[PDB]
Structures are given as C-alpha cells and as structure tokens.
Ligand binder design. Structure first.
Ligand SMILES: NC(=O)[C@H]1CCCN(C(=O)CC2CSC2)C1
Ligand SMILES: [Zn+2]
Length: 140
C-alpha cells in the first residue's frame, strides 16, 4: 500500500483505490494502473520533472529503501493477475529490486522529487508507474 500526496491530490495504484477514492475521483487510467482522487488537506510530496534513471524506492516487505537503476517509461507486458488480464501496461519502468505482494504503492524518488509508485514486480523484478509526465498534478 502507499500513495503520493501532492497539493490536493492523492495518487494511488488504481487496483488499490478505495470507495472514498472512487467517490472523489479526479482521473484514472487502467493501462497505467493509476488513480488520482481529491483531498481536503494539502500534501507534502513534490513531483520530479526530470529525466533521471537512478533513484531510491521503498520496499514495505523489507522495511527498506533501495537504490535502483530503472528503465525509461515504456509499454511492458504484464502477465495475468487477480487485478488485470494479460496486457501491456504503459508508462512502466523496470528495475532489479526485490517485490512481493503487499508492495504496490511504495514511492520511487530521485534528487528532484517523486518519480512514481511501485506497480509491477517479481523474480526480482520491481516495476513502477511513472508520474513525471502528469504536469497537472502541480496545479489546480
Ligand atoms: N500493475 C499490475 O498489473 C500488477 C497488479 C498487482 C500484481 N502485479 C504484480 O506485479 C505483483 C508484484 C509484487 S508487488 C507487484 C501486477
Ligand atoms: Zn530527478
């Protein structure tokens, strides 16, 4: 579990969104595994607006932050889950990290701010939903 709190937005994995998220919906995209809902209180996270391919992510199944190298956002095949059917998830970045279920949500960050949020993983893979192109998170 985990979310990004920027401005009056809460960014979560779409497959972990609550009823309150759906009832206060701003934007959702199943192909990216992302959902954004509105918040009453202002958040403290800042979104990175950069081209970093190195950063650090939080792994809840280890209680640890790990440094990682990650690929550029791309269309990657995601096998069948209890969450989605075989498809291609877009705007996904992969790294060698550990992951296990209970993982989605953890933040990936660089020196500029938040880059994205664990979304994929396994056999040593940990893939993350990029948010750096969502410029509207910084306003309104
Ligand atoms: N984004 C997806 O399609 C996910 C949905 C949940 C399951 N999934 C995973 O890769 C689970 C790993 C271990 S924590 C992430 C595919
Ligand atoms: Zn950066």
């Amino acid at each position: 579990s985990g979310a990004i709190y920027v401005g009056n937005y809460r960014v979560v994995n779409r497959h972990l969104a609550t009823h309150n998220d759906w009832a206060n919906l701003v934007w959702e995209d199943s192909s990216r595994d992302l959902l954004v809902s509105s918040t009453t209180a202002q958040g403290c996270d800042t979104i990175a607006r950069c081209d970093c391919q190195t950063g650090v992510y939080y792994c809840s199944s280890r209680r640890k932050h790990y440094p990682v190298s990650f690929s550029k956002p791309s269309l990657i095949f995601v096998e069948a889950s209890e969450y989605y059917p075989a498809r291609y998830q877009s705007h996904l970045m992969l790294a060698v990290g550990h992951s296990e279920p209970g993982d989605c949500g953890g933040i990936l960050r660089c020196q500029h701010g938040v880059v994205g949020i664990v979304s994929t993983g396994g056999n040593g893979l940990v893939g993350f939903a990029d948010v750096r192109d969502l410029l509207w998170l910084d306003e309104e």
